[PDB]
Design a protein around this ligand. Structure first.
Ligand SMILES: O=CNc1c(C(=O)O)ncn1[C@@H]1O[C@H](COP(=O)(O)O)[C@@H](O)[C@H]1O
Ligand SMILES: NC(=O)c1ncn([C@@H]2O[C@H](COP(=O)(O)O)[C@@H](O)[C@H]2O)c1N
Ligand SMILES: NC(=O)c1ncn([C@@H]2O[C@H](COP(=O)(O)O)[C@@H](O)[C@H]2O)c1N
Ligand SMILES: [K+]
Ligand SMILES: [K+]
Lengths: 516, 517
């Protein structure tokens, strides 16, 4: 088992939470406590005897208190080797079985908005060196870096020490915390201490760590395994969603929920988005209710909504839940659910019901690629051209207020559709969506075929300019009255002429919204 | 700015050390060093103060604690801006270090060749990182160099009367990046090898990674978004390490498309060329003749969509292929290499980005970030039990002739790279109709048939997921498709099998799914 009885413990903690309880426990079991500064005073003020580190070393400007061989030899001596044991005995140095250290809170000093000098001062040197030394010498030493493990220490103390397996685990955790601490120190120094000139949108180095939340049902396909990880520092998202009902989440369930969440919060009005394979099959807004927004979004493409992922940018009502319960739905994500809505959704056993925190706009997006990573600013639909006031009317009569709000809806909805994308919309609802096409005219053909009869009199949005007039002709031939696209082709006037010939209102934004 | 008087050197890699040491010694700098670093310097006749003289502590525990001493760290950590700290050093008899040169044993680089658990544990450096962190924390006084790359900078600093405060801040920032990279590597190895969890978990409880900026891209997904490319120095080279031989700067989409085209091409054993548009193939083809034949076949699938496409070949691009690529509007071409004269033919068009990438190593993990976290999965290597045609179930119709079967295997493997819901119609080792990224399976079948046109009659088809209803299969059968391959697995499978039986279509069930997003 490899249990070693605890005889000497080295305690040097910034956070003194649970320290007196731990110290009482250790002292009662005849453990010698060796401690530094304010940790030693906290213990001694209770009457518990404590050996100062200065008595061990015989050396007294603060910043270098435990960086001494009479500390580190006791931590690093491999007691499995006779020659290391003999060296300690000859130097009159005893080993430490237990090392309890928690570091200067650097990330919290930064989080409180302290100066450069104050944050630099909270960079611990001795602490990580003690933790790494005890972690490296896990066959002999046990290292605890959080007051959470203190009852584990008193339990191990009662059991005649920690096992070898327990000490390996503690060492592994110790090195994770040191890596997290250093990521935080390196990230802050790059940003605040030594930034680039001229200041750059993305830094020269990027580092992050995550903690496993759960194993998923499977990956993108059942022969692939997958896991979900959370970023404890980040603002809560889908990775922190609360599951209130249903079978376990798969990888695709999470990617779809994330895509549906983003598509719903891309609208100011009450909005419901229905997603299939990271693409919307139906999006709608309402000035009436969530239920009306869900009905409109579902009626766009009921055949595709089968096994869909639903997101609402407001509380799901009982009225909406009743309709969702009659449709095959895999996932529903919302900022909350009205009294009785969860019970209506729970009528179907498998549907995953999630509660998520409302999104925080203006972040950076990570996109991994083979051998590396792409980092970009997220498309927040806030470009100069995303404001309809900044649109250029290329041909036709200006849109009436109802036609314009539909154009803004179709325009904002085209962001979430994978490229090449065409969104045909009317009365704040999509009627035909042409997604993920390798050419623009096929995306226009798709949206027209799906839209069916509802295309006549509707508006359309193109996420990129029409390179040739055929894509626009497809929409005009189907009865689309107004079209909004970025413009920007050398062939723009051919496209504008085709819309002029058809008597179609055409707007140019100068802003593009590809998504993949 | 501070003149360098005392330097602390402890380097694993001794590259440029003697040139640095002769530079420092000539400028009257006292070198404080230990072990093999001190011998390398002394063997040249350059005087060196051993760390053991400074500490006065004997040779114990295989050097595990040699520099963890206050006469080392007080010299590093004394804030010389505080008269009190400067007064403390005098009262204790400890001099300051203006320069700290430390390079560690390459832990990350040797985990793959780590002899045992005990040997890797022994390689964990304690003193080294503590010296680097201490000098980095005390950057207002100390300069910390962790790579022989910065030695030229040190000699230049010696000529100008020391490093500036701004230079020392930058060095400290780099020092902490290297420390963080070292610790990510030690933490990752301990989780995996030292203390793994029981029962066996495919993905560990903690995951950490860092990247280094390679370049700023033309723009992000759209021009109003900025973007940058980062590389993983520990990983096997991929698209992030590609060498650009020609063309305008790469955009974010150029890289995502190149990555998708690279993966689609290496999904085939035979000579293969994939043409991608918005992360989806518009044309894929294999050849037993040449790369040029594979590119022509793939381009013929959909020439209108190949306009502004991203091309990947899983073999060397020939002159013959470059000559056809030069007549077509192409944004990016990625290949493991180019034949003599092929690059010159490609360079006839100014803007085309010509890239050379390392052949991929199968069986890795994929990262997919989501709001507030990350999804990690095993990559789909097309090696499931059902990916072997020998393990397919013939549900109806006559068994496929050898030519029909090889086309089915091609269509099947090609359907992996197409975004879901996906349908691939193929013939003679080439796609003729691709239905991609559809919110419903029957629309993906309709797309593939409309694009395929006349070519669909007599061709084979592959579905990346089962047909939930017979309509998607009826669409293919009504168009003249002779054989179809899909996973099966629906409660409605027999309705789908009956529809194929009614049409006299050969139908195979694999039991393996290949969604991609
Ligand atoms: O960077 C300095 N940190 C060091 C050192 C050293 O630099 O020699 N020794 C112990 N520590 C840490 O000091 C804190 C505990 O000391 P107190 O007991 O006085 O609060 C805890 O945060 C311990 O990490
Ligand atoms: N056979 C199909 O077309 C199919 N099978 C499942 N799905 C949908 O794929 C999504 C991912 O399913 P899984 O959670 O099995 O990864 C869920 O929306 C699901 O209804 C399909 N479109
Ligand atoms: N207007 C369009 O449909 C369009 N404009 C550009 N593109 C293609 O988008 C891809 C990415 O372009 P960029 O690098 O600008 O992001 C390249 O293939 C490019 O030819 C389009 N499909
Ligand atoms: K889009
Ligand atoms: K696929």
């Amino acid at each position: 088992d490899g249990r070693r009885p605890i005889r000497r413990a080295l305690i040097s903690v910034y956070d003194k939470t649970g320290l007196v309880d731990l110290a009482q426990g250790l002292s009662a079991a005849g453990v010698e406590i060796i401690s530094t500064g304010s940790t030693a005073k906290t213990i001694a003020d209770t009457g518990i005897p404590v050996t100062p580190v200065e008595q061990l070393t015989g050396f007294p400007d603060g910043r270098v208190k435990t960086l001494h061989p009479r500390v580190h030899a006791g931590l690093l001596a491999d007691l499995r080797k006779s020659e290391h044991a003999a060296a300690l005995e000859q130097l009159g140095i005893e080993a430490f079985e237990l090392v309890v250290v928690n570091l200067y809170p650097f990330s919290q000093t930064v989080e409180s908005g302290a100066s450069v000098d104050d944050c630099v001062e909270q960079i611990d040197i001795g602490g990580p060196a003690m933790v790494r030394a005890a972690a490296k010498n896990h066959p002999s030493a046990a290292v605890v870096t959080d007051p959470l493990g203190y009852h584990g220490v008193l339990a191990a103390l009662r059991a005649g020490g920690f096992t070898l397996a327990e000490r390996k685990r503690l060492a592994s955790l110790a090195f994770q915390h040191i890596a997290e601490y250093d990521i935080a120190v390196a990230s802050w120094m790059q940003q605040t201490l030594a930034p680039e000139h001229p200041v750059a949108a993305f830094p020269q180095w990027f580092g992050r760590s995550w903690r496993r939340v759960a194993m998923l049902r499977y990956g993108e396909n059942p022969h692939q395994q997958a896991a979900l990880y959370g970023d404890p520092t980040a603002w809560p998202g889908l990775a922190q969603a609360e599951q209130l009902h249903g079978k376990d989440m798969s990888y695709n369930n999470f990617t779809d929920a994330d895509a549906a969440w983003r598509a719903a919060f891309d609208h100011e009005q009450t909005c419901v988005a229905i997603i299939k394979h990271a693409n919307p099959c139906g999006i709608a807004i309402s000035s009436v209710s969530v239920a009306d927004a869900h009905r409109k979004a579902h009626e766009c493409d009921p055949l595709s909504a089968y096994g869909g992922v639903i997101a609402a940018n407001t509380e799901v009502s009982v009225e909406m839940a009743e309709y969702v319960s009659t449709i095959f739905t895999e996932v529903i994500v919302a900022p909350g659910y009205a009294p009785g809505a969860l019970d209506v959704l729970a009528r179907k056993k498998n549907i995953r019901v999630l509660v998520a925190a409302e999104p925080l706009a203006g972040g950076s997006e990570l996109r991994p690629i083979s051998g590396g990573l792409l980092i970009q600013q997220s498309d927040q639909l806030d470009a100069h051209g995303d404001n309809p006031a900044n649109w250029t009317l290329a041909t036709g009569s200006p849109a009436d207020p109802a036609t314009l709000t539909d154009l803004v809806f179709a325009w904002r909805a085209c962001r979430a559709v994978k490229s090449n994308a065409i969104v045909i919309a009317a009365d704040g609802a999509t009627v035909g969506v042409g997604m993920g096409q390798v050419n623009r005219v096929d995306a226009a053909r798709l949206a027209v075929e799906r839209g069916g009869e509802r295309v006549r009199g509707a508006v359309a949005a193109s996420d990129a300019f029409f390179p040739f007039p055929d894509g626009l002709e497809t929409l005009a031939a189907a009865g689309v009255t107004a079209v909004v696209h970025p413009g920007g082709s050398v062939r723009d006037e051919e496209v504008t002429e085709a819309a002029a010939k058809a008597g179609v209102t055409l707007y140019l934004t100068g802003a593009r919204h590809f998504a993949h």
